[PDB]
Paper text:
The crystal structure of the TthCS dimer also reveals an extensive dimer interface with buried surface areas of 3053 Å2 for chain A and 3099 Å2 for chain B. The observation that 25% of the protein is involved in dimer interactions clearly indicates that the enzyme is a functional homodimer. In each chain of TthCS continuous electron density was found which fits the structure of the cofactor. Therefore, in this structure the covalently bound state of PLP has been captured. The PLP is located between α1 and α5. The holo form of TthCS confirms the residues involved in binding PLP. TcCS and TthCS both have PLP bound in the active site and therefore represent holo forms of the enzyme. PLP and OAS were not added to either protein during expression or purification and were likely to have been scavenged from the E. coli cells in which the protein was expressed. In contrast, LiCS forms an apo CS structure as no PLP is bound in the active site. The LiCS structure and chain A of TcCS are in the open form, whereas chains B, C and D of TcCS and TthCS are in the closed form.
Residue numbers in the entry:
A (entry chain B): 24 to 350
B (entry chain A): 23 to 351
Amino acid sequence: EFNKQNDVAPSVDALIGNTPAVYLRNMNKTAATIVLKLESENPMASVKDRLAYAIYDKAEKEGKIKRGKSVIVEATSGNTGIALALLGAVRGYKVIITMPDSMSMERRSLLRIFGAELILTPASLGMKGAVAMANRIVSNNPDAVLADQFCTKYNAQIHEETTGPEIWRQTKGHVDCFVAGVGTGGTLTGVARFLKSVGCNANIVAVEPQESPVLSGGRPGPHRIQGIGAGFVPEVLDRELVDEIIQVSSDKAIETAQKLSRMDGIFCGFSAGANVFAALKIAERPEMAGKTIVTVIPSFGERYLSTALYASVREEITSLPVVPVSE
Amino acid sequence: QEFNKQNDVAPSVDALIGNTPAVYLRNMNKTAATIVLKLESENPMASVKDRLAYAIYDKAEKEGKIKRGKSVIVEATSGNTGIALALLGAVRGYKVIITMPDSMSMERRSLLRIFGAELILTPASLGMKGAVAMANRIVSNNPDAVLADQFCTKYNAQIHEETTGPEIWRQTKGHVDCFVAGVGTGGTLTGVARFLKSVGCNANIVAVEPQESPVLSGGRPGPHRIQGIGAGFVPEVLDRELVDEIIQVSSDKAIETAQKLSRMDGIFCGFSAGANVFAALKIAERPEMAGKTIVTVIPSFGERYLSTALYASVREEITSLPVVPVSEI
Ligand SMILES: *Cc1c(COP(=O)(O)O)cnc(C)c1O
Ligand SMILES: *Cc1c(COP(=O)(O)O)cnc(C)c1O
Ligand SMILES: [Cl-]
């Protein structure tokens, strides 16, 4: 009996989740239906808003942190720190985020606009170095807690309680396959568990980068698909629930993102491109005719505008004429 | 089963426009008034203008004034109206041409091209008067071109009287003592106002303009930093007879307010939201507004304004920053 279109929210943390879903319209010329769950429509434009919500809300409820006193600490060069910052501002906690020096001014402003404290580590050390400084500050201060996004039990829990039930209602009980990229793995896992709760046997599909195919027989590498494919198996990912793995090149991911905008009005990030690519691969399978596939759009595209994802679109806008003496 | 975003699957992105959330302003409000913020920032391309694009396309199609694949939508705009018109072009299968001056950033031109809009750069020297003239030129050359016409169109206020107004009425359960909003085209103000008079609500209707360009108060058009409002003239769309009062807000008071909205309430938004909230808070201090409900609009999400004046001060802090030394393991 909280409805965002019908009611006034008490505060912005109440606007987390209950995200829309949209049929994939033009790009789908298969006989499968594809539902896109738009996590991009969360308040700070990331699925990670659900995770920050869970950490703060569940830690508070298990007496494990308190307003004014607690200090939330994380090493994150992505959206999790934005979301932690956001909920810090709303709920009255000091937040410290640790990240490599290579991060853009846009991604550091996003933290500091919410009052978070930054502490930067040298680029060559990367994320192992940030992880390092995070643990250092956490055990030095009696008031610090590490969020612990990759190992926390709050991660899959929140998706089993929110994202799952929502998709189930939104599709009215028709989900024949659920496809999602694995970052922390909480989205895939949390949703899968919900579907097993209600006796739905939808095929569960993980999506990984080709340039880092860790959930298969493959070694960690670099890839440009921000938010998924972290170079290991997360503790949070329940592997037994996963029926199938689909690898996507960065290139097939960027193509797909760019078409999503041009063809369907769905402005999103790299991970979204991968997920939809995977969805559409699955939809072309002959046994999937008349079935429903659900995937996730995890982030809105605006954060990724000055990145490889829209490099080709930035080619075409320079290479354009001014005009001079016409009126 | 009218459309509910939380419980339904939209047929396409245009069906997700409108039905935006509302949130009470909590920490920044040191008054005895309640302040409701209508979050137009939560539209699909993150501004209020998505409602206007929807209206133009949807009403023009229904009056036979345009046809898919045939008709070409044209507008001169260096702001969010262009993004919305682009978006709906992509979704509904129309060609869009946007004219703007050459001074526009690669970020703001990407946002258009990503939807396959056509761009036409006019010279920065001539600014917007120059873009406006090109747009009219293209429209008179091409029998299938249509000017979106954001400042003059009947569609603009209509959509706010049919959607924005009714939504606010349901969300506030009929408690609206004042509606305050910045005037770009004037359609949000006017459309909501008309709706409130339709249901017999006599809320005080408040326009907000930039202090440095106080045209609705008889000052002269001037420069200001408050993207979205203060066009430098009175739009035909604006019904001034419905407006009870005008409040001016400095660019600087608009920036401070937007920065606090983030820091203090988690509401990440642009300059015009800053202005609106500031104005709402000025009204809320009035003694006669004690225990009354003031509604305003957050028109756009903040991420588009990250490399602008709005967050310049915050970008100071993050560039002059320590790394830490040889001191990890
Ligand atoms: C976190 C993240 C995901 C993956 O979701 P998990 O909860 O980690 O499975 C996908 N892409 C982006 C953009 C992310 O921010
Ligand atoms: C256009 C717009 C407004 C003004 O709304 P109107 O309905 O056009 O008066 C305010 N701020 C921003 C950012 C907008 O894009
Ligand atoms: Cl006053």
